[PDB]
Scaffold this active site. Structure first.
Site, short mmCIF file in Angstrom:
data_model
loop_
_atom_site.label_atom_id
_atom_site.label_comp_id
_atom_site.label_asym_id
_atom_site.label_seq_id
_atom_site.Cartn_x
_atom_site.Cartn_y
_atom_site.Cartn_z
NE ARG A 146 -27.86 -46.33 -27.79
CZ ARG A 146 -27.49 -46.80 -28.98
NH1 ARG A 146 -26.43 -46.29 -29.63
NH2 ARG A 146 -28.19 -47.77 -29.55
CG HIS B 40 -26.56 -41.98 -33.42
ND1 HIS B 40 -27.13 -42.00 -32.16
CD2 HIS B 40 -26.21 -43.26 -33.70
CE1 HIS B 40 -27.19 -43.25 -31.74
NE2 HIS B 40 -26.63 -44.03 -32.64
N1 LIG Z 1 -23.91 -45.69 -34.42
C1 LIG Z 1 -23.52 -45.81 -33.16
O1 LIG Z 1 -22.93 -44.80 -32.40
C2 LIG Z 1 -23.63 -47.19 -32.58
C3 LIG Z 1 -23.41 -47.39 -31.23
N2 LIG Z 1 -23.44 -48.66 -30.74
C4 LIG Z 1 -23.22 -48.93 -29.31
O2 LIG Z 1 -22.24 -50.00 -29.11
C5 LIG Z 1 -22.65 -50.74 -27.98
C6 LIG Z 1 -21.92 -52.07 -27.92
O3 LIG Z 1 -22.29 -52.91 -28.99
P1 LIG Z 1 -21.67 -54.37 -28.98
O4 LIG Z 1 -20.17 -54.35 -28.96
O5 LIG Z 1 -22.50 -55.11 -29.91
O6 LIG Z 1 -22.18 -54.74 -27.54
P2 LIG Z 1 -21.75 -55.88 -26.56
O7 LIG Z 1 -22.94 -56.08 -25.70
O8 LIG Z 1 -21.40 -57.08 -27.28
O9 LIG Z 1 -20.57 -55.24 -25.72
C7 LIG Z 1 -20.76 -54.47 -24.55
C8 LIG Z 1 -19.49 -54.66 -23.71
O10 LIG Z 1 -19.61 -53.90 -22.54
C9 LIG Z 1 -19.28 -54.65 -21.43
N3 LIG Z 1 -20.02 -54.18 -20.30
C10 LIG Z 1 -21.36 -54.02 -20.17
N4 LIG Z 1 -21.58 -53.46 -18.96
C11 LIG Z 1 -20.41 -53.24 -18.35
C12 LIG Z 1 -20.10 -52.69 -17.13
N5 LIG Z 1 -21.08 -52.25 -16.31
N6 LIG Z 1 -18.76 -52.60 -16.75
C13 LIG Z 1 -17.76 -53.02 -17.62
N7 LIG Z 1 -18.10 -53.57 -18.85
C14 LIG Z 1 -19.42 -53.67 -19.19
C15 LIG Z 1 -19.60 -56.07 -21.78
O11 LIG Z 1 -18.84 -56.89 -20.95
P3 LIG Z 1 -18.75 -58.48 -21.09
O12 LIG Z 1 -17.99 -58.90 -22.31
O13 LIG Z 1 -18.00 -58.99 -19.90
O14 LIG Z 1 -20.12 -59.02 -20.97
C16 LIG Z 1 -19.23 -56.08 -23.24
O15 LIG Z 1 -17.88 -56.39 -23.40
C17 LIG Z 1 -24.16 -50.80 -28.16
O16 LIG Z 1 -24.80 -50.93 -26.92
C18 LIG Z 1 -24.49 -49.42 -28.67
O17 LIG Z 1 -24.86 -48.63 -27.62
C19 LIG Z 1 -23.72 -49.73 -31.56
C20 LIG Z 1 -23.92 -49.55 -32.90
C21 LIG Z 1 -23.89 -48.24 -33.43
CL LIG Z 2 -27.14 -49.18 -32.10
#
Ligand SMILES: NC(=O)C1=CN([C@@H]2O[C@H](COP(=O)(O)OP(=O)(O)OC[C@H]3O[C@@H](n4cnc5c(N)ncnc54)[C@H](OP(=O)(O)O)[C@@H]3O)[C@@H](O)[C@H]2O)C=CC1
Ligand SMILES: [Cl-]
Ligand SMILES: NC(=O)C1=CN([C@@H]2O[C@H](COP(=O)(O)OP(=O)(O)OC[C@H]3O[C@@H](n4cnc5c(N)ncnc54)[C@H](OP(=O)(O)O)[C@@H]3O)[C@@H](O)[C@H]2O)C=CC1
Ligand SMILES: C[N+](C)(CCO)CCCS(=O)(=O)O
Ligand SMILES: [Cl-]
Ligand SMILES: [Cl-]
Ligand SMILES: [Cl-]
Lengths: 312, 312
Positions: free
Chosen positions: B227, B275
């Site tokens: 993001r 994006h």
């Molecule tokens: N076109 C684009 O640019 C796109 C962008 N995205 C972005 O990718 C992001 C991730 O997607 P996805 O992999 O499905 O999401 P997930 O929710 O599965 O992964 C998010 C990861 O971040 C970790 N996490 C969350 N908060 C923290 C924190 N405060 N400190 C350390 N680690 C943290 C989680 O930890 P844990 O495993 O321990 O819970 C998890 O491993 C989406 O939110 C989106 O914003 C997605 C699709 C398209």
């Molecule tokens: Cl997304």
């Protein structure tokens, strides 16, 4: 046994020690003008004619994958190497992986249209673009050898349709083999990314010119990783400015270094690397060379022989 | 069961049709202003607050991986998604492969120094450059999730040293797992390429700032695929100009479309895409949504739920 070594850019001292370490029985030395003392083997790259001229050698090892340099000299100066002296080259020795890096990176780059997105950036224009499908993004590899095989295998894993062109039919699963000049037109037909991994021979020189570029679909791409002589630099520029080619990337050129005169430097849809795609890993080379020498001394089977009749 | 659907750009007619046929007993409809009729489920993406505000629903399915669009609005509008309404997102559904494409192409791009080489092409200058070793070119993935895992998979396969950062310990092959802010500095310390795949939460907004960048080694790279709020844009540019960062590639930004007066546009070491990194595959999304709805109706357990307590 005596061994001479010549290379205009590598550290002779390193190779001297490395080879002697690999072949304890051997006396290795750096060759230079005036060195007319006997030798059994020679390790070379861009050797002067006075080096091999009339020498009695058991074998000559070319320190790269290409052997066009030395084969062109041997043609303009047949007194350099007698036809009885077998010639060897480096097959893979780490160049396989480097070609896979280059190809996978760049085929993905064009497929995701990062070239357009960089264009659009330089204007300061935010503009999404439709995705290309995989079915329309076939990868055609001219030269299905040691290196072509490694590349096609790295790209196949990503789901792009793959085809290859060579003088002999290949039977690799997930790849379609095009053979000879008869099938060249077919191969070019539905090929989106043209990847060149051909050796430079009298039979392949200039193969990428206006004629060839017309048999490719509009918006096609050219990744030249072989040798500069393979492509007509003026014809490449013309195929890009017309819209037949969407883009290209070149690692080798007509002349190296490339003179600032060359318009390639200034054209925006031409990526350029200074002949650095794949270099041999010295330790892997030493291993191959020393093993082949051991095997040649024993009259046992060897690999990497150059077939001088076919010219590569 | 009544289902309401809304998406700003997708073809509503197509989704309504697909969903009714995946769910024969459902009456599916595109939502539009003025629609105050009841619904049991809602499929949404960047929906207006008026659509969900006040609604009694069995579930809300967000049509993507990120749920910040909705959530970010809950503080001010708790009314939008009553705490009793389970919220879902799209896990992978073909986005994993698109992230892998993006990451493998560009990490390999920077490793082979293709960025310097285009800068060199732009100075009509022929200059081979030193090779980076794999051991100095560690990849750090912040956000070790559905997508981050996919990317780690595709990159560890090239032999890059890999590391990940998350809130819980991960056990993946060839990957070093770092956890929480107590291990963040350790994670950043030898990360050459930092890939961001974090979700947008209050804990991550502004994470990539001047101070995080200082914790990186010199000559590092930033690949932002999550993001736009995750990066402090001014601090990025300072790091690029001071040498701390060698390069950056960004798919997301502070404001989208990014204003033409933003200096990111002209910084020659900042590639950018509008994006477009990964989008769901409709048939895969429909598959997931439909099966989850069926399981929910049977009182059966399901996956893909947003933990509203954690915020992602
Ligand atoms: N076109 C684009 O640019 C796109 C962008 N995205 C972005 O990718 C992001 C991730 O997607 P996805 O992999 O499905 O999401 P997930 O929710 O599965 O992964 C998010 C990861 O971040 C970790 N996490 C969350 N908060 C923290 C924190 N405060 N400190 C350390 N680690 C943290 C989680 O930890 P844990 O495993 O321990 O819970 C998890 O491993 C989406 O939110 C989106 O914003 C997605 C699709 C398209
Ligand atoms: Cl997304
Ligand atoms: N940094 C760089 O830019 C580097 C460039 N190279 C270049 O890569 C080339 C490929 O090396 P490598 O893969 O080891 O070599 P190989 O000899 O193993 O492969 C060459 C392939 O080209 C095919 N071929 C040769 N002539 C023709 C022809 N006239 N028509 C159709 N096909 C032909 C051969 O066909 P077949 O199988 O039937 O015999 C073979 O498949 C080198 O010759 C060199 O020029 C190599 C290393 C680095
Ligand atoms: C004020 N309303 C009509 C706005 C709907 O977005 C609330 C509707 C209540 S319900 O039908 O979902 O149970
Ligand atoms: Cl050397
Ligand atoms: Cl070579
Ligand atoms: Cl659609």
């Amino acid at each position: 046994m005596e061994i001479i070594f010549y290379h205009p850019t590598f550290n002779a001292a390193w190779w001297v020690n490395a080879l002697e370490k690999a072949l304890p029985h051997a006396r290795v030395r750096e060759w230079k003008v005036g060195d007319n003392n006997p030798a059994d083997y020679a390790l070379v790259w861009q050797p002067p004619v006075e080096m091999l001229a009339g020498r009695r050698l058991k074998a000559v090892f070319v320190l790269g994958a290409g052997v066009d340099a030395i084969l062109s000299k041997l043609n303009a100066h047949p007194e350099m190497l007698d036809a009885s002296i077998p010639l060897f080259r480096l097959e893979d020795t780490g160049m396989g992986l480097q070609m896979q890096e280059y190809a996978v990176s760049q085929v993905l780059h064009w497929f995701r249209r990062f070239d357009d997105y960089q264009a659009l950036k330089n204007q300061a224009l935010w503009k999404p673009l439709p995705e290309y499908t995989r079915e329309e993004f076939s990868v055609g590899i001219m030269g299905a050898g040691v290196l072509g095989a490694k590349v096609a295998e790295s790209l196949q894993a990503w789901g792009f349709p793959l085809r290859c062109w060579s003088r002999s039919r290949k039977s690799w699963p997930g790849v379609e083999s095009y053979v000879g000049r008869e099938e060249l037109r077919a191969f070019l037909n539905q090929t989106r990314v043209l990847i060149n991994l051909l050796p430079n021979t009298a039979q392949t020189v200039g193969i990428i010119n206006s004629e060839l570029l017309d048999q490719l679909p509009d918006g096609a791409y050219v990744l030249n990783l072989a040798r500069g002589v393979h492509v007509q630099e003026a014809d490449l520029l013309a195929a890009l400015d017309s819209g037949k080619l969407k883009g290209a990337m070149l690692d080798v050129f007509s002349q190296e270094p490339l003179p600032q005169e060359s318009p390639l430097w200034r054209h925006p849809r031409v990526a350029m690397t200074p002949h650095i795609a794949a270099v041999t890993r010295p330790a892997e080379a030493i291993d191959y060379i020393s093993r082949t020498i051991t095997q040649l001394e024993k009259g046992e089977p060897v690999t990497g022989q150059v077939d001088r009749a076919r010219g590569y």
